[PDB]
Nucleic acid binder design. Structure first.
Ligand SMILES: Cc1cn([C@H]2C[C@H](O)[C@@H](COP(=O)(O)C(F)(F)P(=O)(O)OP(=O)(O)O)O2)c(=O)[nH]c1=O
Ligand SMILES: [Cl-]
Ligand SMILES: [Cl-]
Ligand SMILES: [Mg+2]
Ligand SMILES: [Mg+2]
Ligand code: NA
Ligand code: NA
Length: 326
DNA sequence: CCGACAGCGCATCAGC
DNA sequence: GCTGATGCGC
DNA sequence: GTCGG
């Protein structure tokens, strides 16, 4: 927040480029510039001081000078006036609705929260749940509740099979005081990169969490990734907790460190680490870190026994989770 | 100037 | 039904 | 939109 007014602007621009313009790279340009400025330990005094940072070019430098002088951006003031942009930007806030679907609905006069409700018949299952819990999903989750959710999950998983290991990652693992949602990494000995000595591994867990009314709805579900909704139980007379989004990822147990690195984030951090790895002749995904052959082809998985080992390969000092929030 | 920009799971569609 | 592309999400 | 080469 030291430079909150500039990062907000940039984030607003990034949102415009992704949702409205469908220009994914401009989106990431802004997001990176926002990220790099957010960690600058000084109160930026000009766009030139900002251009010194990597990711901030001429254009963003001008926009920053404009913002520093007036306290706003003409481009955004205008963008805020345009009804289509206002609408499309808003519809994308429903989980399941992206830039494409947003622009489509608008082409049908469906541009408000109310228009969606009366037109629920035109939503796929995901967008339906998104709309249903639109309010709740915008709320943040206090670490204290996160801690309660962790308990329920770890204990319920334990009851399905003592060999399951559930790790809450995301901003939670990064030490955040509040989280947008709960991200859960799941491993079991019966599922490695070598074999799936047992099916329904993920299913049985979703099943158990649904049975104890923790999981309330499903957005999507596969053999390795679950995307849904959950809710903490409330006390007698106690007002209900907001519903919460929950992601669960089953990863081969011999690939845990690459998997936990991935899920811990942040998303920008992973982008930067993965890009940096490429520059060092490596490629990293949630499963492994392979070498890039002379021809670019990804080699075989490199032995990994800790998060740090991965960091070593790309010659990066180990950074704790709490320092990966970019 | 110019190509790269991280990597992948799930739902859904088109074409077969 | 499949594969492969696309949209949307992590 | 920004970057390395
Ligand atoms: C969105 C996304 C996510 N990730 C990885 C890192 C996140 O920590 C992790 C969790 O995905 P996420 O979508 O839950 C998150 F990024 F928002 P998170 O960092 O948890 O913050 P919060 O939800 O706002 O509390 O998944 C990527 O690698 N790329 C992406 O584009
Ligand atoms: Cl690993
Ligand atoms: Cl792999
Ligand atoms: Mg999260
Ligand atoms: Mg998540
Ligand atoms: Na720069
Ligand atoms: Na959306």
């Amino acid at each position: 927040t030291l430079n909150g007014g500039i990062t907000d602007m940039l984030t607003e621009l990034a949102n415009f480029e992704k949702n409205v313009s469908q220009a994914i790279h401009k989106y990431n340009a802004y997001r990176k510039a926002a990220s790099v400025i957010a960690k600058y330990p000084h109160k930026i005094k000009s766009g030139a001081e900002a251009k010194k940072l990597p990711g901030v070019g001429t254009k963003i430098a001008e926009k920053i000078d404009e913002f520093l002088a007036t306290g706003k951006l003409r481009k955004l003031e205008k963008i805020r006036q345009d009804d289509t942009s206002s609408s499309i930007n808003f519809l994308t806030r429903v989980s399941g609705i992206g830039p494409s679907a947003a622009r489509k609905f608008v082409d049908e006069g469906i541009k408000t929260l109310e228009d969606l409700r009366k037109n629920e018949d035109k939503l796929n299952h995901h967008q339906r749940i998104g709309l249903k819990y639109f309010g709740d999903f915008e709320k943040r989750i206090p670490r204290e509740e996160m801690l309660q959710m962790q308990d329920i999950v770890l204990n319920e998983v334990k009851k399905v099979d003592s060999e399951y290991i559930a790790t809450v990652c995301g901003s939670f693992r990064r030490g955040a005081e509040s989280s947008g949602d709960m991200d859960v990494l799941l491993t079991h000995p019966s599922f490695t990169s070598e074999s799936t000595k047992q099916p329904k591994l993920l299913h049985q867990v979703v099943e158990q969490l649904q049975k104890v009314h923790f999981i309330t709805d499903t957005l999507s579900k596969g053999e390795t990734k679950f995307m849904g909704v959950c809710q903490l139980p409330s006390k007698n007379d106690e007002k209900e907790y907001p519903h919460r989004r929950i992601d669960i990822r089953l990863i081969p147990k011999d690939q845990y460190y690459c998997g936990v690195l991935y899920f811990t984030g942040s998303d920008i951090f992973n982008k930067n680490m993965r890009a940096h790895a490429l520059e060092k002749g490596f490629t990293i995904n949630e499963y492994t870190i392979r070498p890039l052959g002379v021809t670019g082809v990804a080699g075989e998985p490199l032995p990994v026994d800790s998060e740090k080992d991965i960091f070593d390969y790309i010659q990066w000092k180990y950074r704790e989770p709490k320092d990966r929030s970019e």
